């Protein structure tokens, strides 16, 4: 029926990634995808995104899953897709990444923090550095820009309008009306 | 049916937008609209609004989706439409925007806040302004007022009564009695 | 069946207005109202009011809905009905506004509050004033009392028993025994 | 089958009033009553009462509802009936008010409080003295006692055993064994 | 002895106004001015100001106290002088007011809030408006600017470097080096 | 329908392990396996591991269960697998432990703590040392490393990219695409 | 199905006892047992233990239901059985008490605490010593150790691994693989 | 005498700035500063600094007082001096600023935040930027570093050990042994 | 007198370093040293240390002063000396570092943590690694041990009795009984 | 002049140890002791004890001091002397350790608790046992019991009335009156 | 003098025991007594008591000191003396224990509480009973009542009026007017 609306929509292969990114809402996204791949492993799957960002590992379970499943996950951003949100948007199938008119994007490097003995802090920061390294690589890839270029652009929070977003390479185009 | 009164009214293509505006309740609006579109792309959709406003991104995900979909989205204001509630109200299809005799409207500029280093304060300070600017443009459109009439009037909380809101281009007419 | 008493009670066209009047409980009432008009826009709708009042804008959404829709909305006060509750009570269809023998009504003026800069206190106060005045008009009008008289009685809290309420023009008669 | 124990008992025309008396559980009781009158205006309705008391106007919505509906509302006190609970128990159809052997009854006067300007304090203090009067008036009407035996009896907490409530006129008899 | 350091500078007629302006610290400052006048009513009094401001009536006891005592109260601002701070800073004896090189001033309007009935709210919005007018006037007098200029300039927080304070007319000049 | 997504995917023998490892969630995962084993003791069970670790007795109830049921348990790590999570991944069916592209693994030693008399401190500290020894042995035997080698790398947190989890012997390979 | 996994496994006559032992969770267990006996008093009941203990009386309501029902209750320790956990584990039908390989059991003496008058303290402490005696009696009984031995081994925490568990008489054998 | 250690060391013209910079601690430092000049404006003053930073304005009241009194102000960092602690340190008399052997210095730009309307956010961001510049100019001025160099060096926290400090121009030399 | 026990002991050139190390108590102790120096530079200062440690920079503000003043600083351990507490005791005048019979010492690496952006993270991680290095070097210096050996023994909490302390070169000898 | 009772008694060489034992009340007792020696190293000091125990290192700092100052330290117990309290009592000068008639003594073992990696948990747990052993040898040394008698007698809390503490050798005698 | 009212009254050999009995206030009381004995070991000391009781050990410290000093100690009860208050009241010098007219005395048995192992509960439970026995013996000693009689009137709270306490032998006489 219309008992659950996100369900009816799931049947239309529409998945919503809304707000904060974290393990449980991430895991729910991931399973929603595996389910759509088993249903029909050919049809695209649409993933709407309105999110301030969130936990990185939780984000990579989503990312690796999108690339892993045969279906092409198109991505469409409404409202906003900041940080790992923006990362996921641009991680969508090629040519199948959008942004509605007034949605906004924000990009930036990884945030984190540890607490401990110098040695452990060493082992942990070293690590958040490997991750920044891989986060930037993957962004160069998906967006087209170059490693050097991203790290520059991403050292500090950076905003992009729907247009600037396409111009930059995070999304392929702006959806304006249903034609 | 009546098992769930809102689900029953969605069947009549009616969506309510009540209270504070945030990602989740907004996602649900977006999902009811997407869903109505899919059921019949030609019939109007009625978006009843009684809100004090809220988070702008969350709202914009509703304005873009409203515009984006094929159906005309008529907006009825009951009780109150303030800030993002008045934006969204005025964003309904032309001619199909109304107010009940005692609805009261209030418009004003964007609110925000950032914390950090002066540098970052810079980016955020200038993005909130880029937003106030796009927002004021769109209010110009849907109202007919000049960009300068709105920046002027939203500079501070401005209350509009039903007839004033009609007289101002916020809504098209006042609904008193069903005939 | 009687799975959900209120759902069941609705089939008999009975909507309940209980507790403090605020945005969501009101929209629920406004929907049961539009829903009943849809089942039969001719038959009277019965509103049970037992409330100490609440948010004026939320209450006006119910008031305007009552006046708007085709069917006559019969008001029955049980327990108490005060401020916005008393107001929504007297706003029922003349001839069909009731009080139970020991119900009690209380009228008074809009209670508000603001915090901020002078310029802004000025605005917001002007608005509470415009509203008080109109609410006063809609009160003279529904009860039959004069505008002078209402202003003179809504300054301080005033209690009316069911009988005085009948004589004040707030309700039409007293329901004592289902005859 | 007892999928919903309380609903199945409702079918046997049984209503439970447990715990503090407040607006909502009180509304639920009214609705169960109107619904049982709807189902059959001729049949007796049984109200079990086990409550310490609560909000007077909430208790009065149940009271007036009991008097209004066509059916007789038989009251049965299990455990305890204090204040509005006692009042509600003695308000059942004459000849059908009962007490279980070890249930205990407590009667007293209205409780209240206020905070504000002296003018308002007076309006509110005078109002609770009327409520107290009317409560005493109705107390005498149902117990048979005179108007002063009641006043003289409710100035302070007063306990009454099952036997004493039959003798005082609060209830008609003790229920000890099904026969 | 340098037992109490401020009690020591007080003997050199130096007075410090530090932090939040509120009744008790304000009263301590007033008492020192009166005490200084008692000791020697001819000699100047230096008030060192470092404050973000605070309560208006609390500050006005200092203002009038300053103007009432025989000695000229010379004011020196360090750190900052905002709101009630900039005000007391400028109310100092004409010709004897200063800003350390890097102190900064901020001027703006009254702030406040009330909760209550529409009738009480109006008495309060009226009042804060009269306070608003006397401050602008007193600010006009003291800076030499014109009323409407002061009004126009205070509507929103305005920062002013010491040079801008000297230009604007809040202080008389910038102290840089003891000579 | 897809009223419970985790429930459908379970139909495909896919179980999820997300977030902190503790008795209840740990117990649910265990029930899913038993349940899956009884459904078909022959087909593989698939367990996605995206955890930061958690309680060791809880993890072991899942471990012994894994090694105990007939079906082969295929572990796939997405997002991340630390401590107990990495221990349960490397604990999957030999040759069927995969690690998605950007999942990061982290293994280390046991965390714990006690409070009380010394005699109990020794009893308990001696117990965590014993658990340690055992986890090292099991980590040895599942990864193929030597007990000495294991002991040497888990004294301190030690991360491991996807490629390293293969070199080190925790997992067998890497799923980068569905094919 | 896979809707309610634990309800699903009740069919294979499998009950899980997870986490803290207390009255309500204990009641669910008792009820699950009584029910499985009503379905077949001949088939074995399988109770999975993973608990750090709990309220003794709660545990005992489970202990006696086990000895009372016709069906043998086979116990299977997963993760850990500590205190009352080890108690209910070692109380399964003799010959059918198992410990998974890496399970681990812990045993000790009763814990408690009272407060109040001295007389009462003597009453309550004299009660915990009886429960103690009785708990050690019953431990000797299912393990075969001398009551004398028990008392020594439980004055303090004592951990036992699966093999150790089997040798102490707590359980009959270790479970390693489905065969 | 050593009744108050801090007062006693005040006789040797010594002053300590310990902990976060905020109006009150700052004032007590300024007053001791004025007090000393007043006792003899020729002898040098010693301001020991061991702070992590604090409220910029609070700090500036101290700065301007340092440059203003005739007494030369010798700064001596111990432990650490970051942010406004770094600034006041390098602000002492040229030639008379130091650094204990293992002192540690940290520099960077302003921190801050605001909440409100777009308009007001602008005014405050505009202000923390006017301040940053000025703060930088002054750093250049006191370390003789290029103005651009400071802008660079203060975009992100930069730790400077004592030698590096001397070299960078923050302090003139390093004190290790009292000769 | 003994009106202030600590002032009197100050009068015998005795300073106490008790509890956690942080700026204010560390500045208090620094102040006592400078004062005792002022009162006689040829004489030994007796500094007692019963501390679990604390903030390194604060510890350092005391270490540098110790090294710096003319008076030989003699350290004496009572109760405990952990972390900065052991560092400060071992930094006493070579030949005058005592340890009471039953005092225990504990050395270990630095503790800390950060939260923020990777770049900043890296910046702080390095910093704590420079600090760790410098402490170790100074541990080697004062204990006569070797830098390497110091790097080994201070990776994990290391305890030592007074005799082991002497033996390690942390203190020079053990005081037992006055003579 | 009895303006401060404890300081007056201090001239009578009477130090009080009251309440929980922790670094600061402990340091004050040490300071009073060193102080009292300095006045006269030949006269007896009296330490009254009424404590429930407390931190060990803190008690040891008191302990060594007692053993270390030339003058004998006579200990008198009032109320109670438990744990470290009891230990500091028996630590008095042989032949001068008194317990008042109804004072009660309690002895037991060190209590502790750590949290962290197994390795660190080992380091701490060995430390707490060495401390236990050393504490025991001391107990043996002052009471003249056997290390073995003390080990057994302390495993769990053991109370000893005043006379029983006399024969156990914790104290040399009961103090009943001032003769 | 009167710079402290109680210090002044001390010079009159008057001590106050007001409120809650606990270690620090009981220590103060003990200190004042030793001091008064040290001024003049001959003259009476006067301890006023207005207490509801408290910690027995804290109390006993006040009791063994009352006996122990040479001066007779006269106890005067004002307001109330309950539990330890009543104990300490009666433990005063025979013939010199008073009770002001309307003071109330209350008596009972020890209150306690403890948590932990059965073994520890027993150890602490015996102790509380030993204390209860000893307290009851002293109570008998001092009142003249038989042991047994004391055990009976102390199982539950027992109030005694002033005169009833002379009768019971708890106090010697009543005081009424300074005669």
Curated annotation (Swiss-Prot), chains A, B, C, D, E, F, G, H, I, J, K:
EC annotation from Swiss-Prot or TrEMBL: 3.4.21.92
BP-aspect Gene Ontology terms: protein quality control for misfolded or incompletely synthesized proteins
InterPro entries noted in UniProt: ClpP, ClpP/crotonase-like_dom_sf, ClpP/TepA, ClpP_His_AS, ClpP_Ser_AS
Class in the EC hierarchy, top level: hydrolase
PROSITE patterns assigned: CLP_PROTEASE_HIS, CLP_PROTEASE_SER
GO CC terms of this entry: cytoplasm; endopeptidase Clp complex
Reactions this protein catalyses: Hydrolysis of proteins to small peptides in the presence of ATP and magnesium. alpha-casein is the usual test substrate. In the absence of ATP, only oligopeptides shorter than five residues are hydrolyzed (such as succinyl-Leu-Tyr-|-NHMec, and Leu-Tyr-Leu-|-Tyr-Trp, in which cleavage of the -Tyr-|-Leu- and -Tyr-|-Trp bonds also occurs)
Primary location: cytoplasm
Positions of the catalytic residues: 83 (nucleophile), 108
Record-linked Pfam families: CLP_protease
Location in or out of the cell: Cytoplasm
One Gene Ontology molecular-function label: ATPase binding
Record key words, sorted: Cytoplasm, Hydrolase, Protease, Serine protease, Zymogen
Biological role: Cleaves peptides in various proteins in a process that requires ATP hydrolysis. Has a chymotrypsin-like activity. Plays a major role in the degradation of misfolded proteins.
The protein's assembly and partners: Fourteen ClpP subunits assemble into 2 heptameric rings which stack back to back to give a disk-like structure with a central cavity, resembling the structure of eukaryotic proteasomes. Component of the ClpAP and ClpXP complexes.
Family recorded in the similarity comment: Belongs to the peptidase S14 family.
Name of the molecule in the record: ATP-dependent Clp protease proteolytic subunit
Organism: Escherichia coli O157:H7
